Design a protein around this ligand. Structure first.
Ligand SMILES: [Mg+2]
Ligand SMILES: [Mg+2]
Ligand SMILES: [Zn+2]
Lengths: 58, 74, 49, 54, 129
RNA sequence: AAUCUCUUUGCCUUUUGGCUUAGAUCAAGUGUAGUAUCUGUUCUUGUAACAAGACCUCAAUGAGGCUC
RNA sequence: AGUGAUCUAGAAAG
RNA sequence: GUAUGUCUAAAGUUAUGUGCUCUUAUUUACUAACAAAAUCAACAUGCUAUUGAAC
């Protein structure tokens, strides 16, 4: 096994879920970016997706 | 091959002298032998061949090595 | 360890417990009047139980 | 350790376990197909008999 | 902790069934759970030559390669996999796939090796004959 | 800015940087020991009557104009 | 006709 | 003995020019550093041969 299937284990995923619930933490680099922009409503999270596009083009 | 090199010079102990010890207690440096000692001051005819008719300084040719090879290779 | 978690993979222990609890509850229901039972309650037990 | 690494890979078709899996699947399909071809010959013979009658 | 640890820590509120259901909802959005290939270490099964740069690749060379399960199956039953490496000199992608019926491999893209289900069923019956 | 070039010598001037069982093997129905996860169904009345950005002043610039 | 003599014990890294 | 390496999130700018629901592994299963010096257990209780059209 490798880092990838360790990070995608049930315990790690559950801890990610609990962290985004309990403290709002979300490493957006883990998650697929929305194809359609308009479904995103928060300015904060839309700007974070914008940051993801920025690091991708870099 | 370039990771695999001979020793051109050895590391100088002058480098280790340039900074102080860091307080690790080694077991072999615990106290021990703490006091110095000081001195006082017919059937044998039928056969064709019967009688009726050291050290050297080379380890490999020494008799011990010959005997050792005859013992341990068979 | 590997062999026994391979046997008990996908939470089979809790499944066995829940199914046997349900079986005993569901057959006690079929004898409720026979045994003069007012109610049979399957309990909401803690998952580690 | 100096052997073929691919003898420890599940996807390697050279492995005897994979060969066995392929072979058993093939035997199931082959037996079914032999049954099929027998009955299809019977269909062909039935057609021939009807044409001989007509 | 050691390699062979028996127990992992679960928080006191952890329900395994709800956790798996939540992680299943999460898995549909993670990048590395949904990419199209699995990285693997493998040996080159045969001697092959790159077509871009003519480099010879001997058998039993280890590579870091990409594994794809293909849609097609041998006799609609057995899994076929594409195995993709990249050329050590020029980094061009070389691909080959498993051939379960022959219990062998067959070349796909980027390289060359050195030296139909109905029809397959009929051929197998004739082979058995 | 005051010479330049070729041969033969002398200098080697990018001029082989350890060790062991030549380190081992040319190779195996692999065995053995670990670490993970499932996979998949599948989804959110029409008609009538009646009513209604510019500029100016103070100054962290916003409140006021029968203003347009 | 029966006296007795009683080793062990598992974890890590490679 | 489950390699390892580099990258980036930075900061805005340093003054000029919830639903449903399959599951008897239905998994894309992953790792090979580890070990390879395999033979006790074999084998039944007595050996075989066959057909050309026509002038
Ligand atoms: Mg090591
Ligand atoms: Mg090693
Ligand atoms: Zn190439």
């Amino acid at each position: 096994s490798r880092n990838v299937d360790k990070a995608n284990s049930v315990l790690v995923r559950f801890q990610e879920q609990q962290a985004e619930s309990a403290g709002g933490y979300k490493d957006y680099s883990r998650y697929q970016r929305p194809r359609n922009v308009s479904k995103v409503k928060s300015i904060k999270e839309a700007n974070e997706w914008k940051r993801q596009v920025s690091k991708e083009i870099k | 091959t370039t990771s695999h090199r001979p020793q051109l010079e050895a590391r100088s102990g002058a480098k280790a002298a340039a900074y102080t010890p860091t307080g690790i207690e080694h077991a072999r440096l615990l106290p021990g032998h703490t006091t110095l000692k000081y001195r006082k001051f017919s059937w044998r005819k039928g056969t064709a061949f019967g009688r009726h008719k050291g050290y050297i300084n080379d380890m490999t040719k020494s008799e011990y090595h010959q005997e050792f090879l005859h013992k341990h290779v068979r | 360890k590997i062999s026994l978690i391979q046997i008990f993979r996908a939470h089979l222990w809790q499944k066995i417990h829940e199914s046997i609890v349900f079986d005993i509850c569901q057959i006690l229901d079929g004898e409720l009047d026979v045994l003069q039972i007012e109610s049979v309650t399957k309990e909401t037990v803690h998952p580690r139980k | 350790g100096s052997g073929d690494l691919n003898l420890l890979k599940s996807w390697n078709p050279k492995l005897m376990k994979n060969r066995k899996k392929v072979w058993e699947t093939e035997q199931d399909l082959i037996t079914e197909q032999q049954k099929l071809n027998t009955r299809l010959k019977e269909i062909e013979k039935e057609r021939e008999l009807n044409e001989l009658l007509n | 902790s050691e390699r062979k640890a028996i127990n992992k820590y679960y928080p006191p509120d952890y329900n395994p069934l709800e956790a798996e259901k939540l992680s299943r909802k999460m898995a549909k959005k993670l990048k590395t759970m949904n990419k199209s290939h699995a990285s693997i270490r493998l040996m080159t099964p045969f001697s092959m030559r790159c077509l871009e740069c003519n480099e010879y690749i001997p058998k039993s060379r280890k590579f870091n390669g990409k594994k794809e399960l293909l849609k097609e199956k041998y006799l609609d039953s057995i899994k076929i996999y594409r195995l993709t490496i990249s050329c050590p000199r020029c980094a061009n992608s070389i691909a080959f796939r498993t051939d379960p019926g022959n219990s062998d491999y067959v070349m796909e893209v980027g390289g060359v090796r050195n030296y139909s289900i109905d029809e397959t069923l009929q051929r197998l019956v004739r082979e058995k004959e």
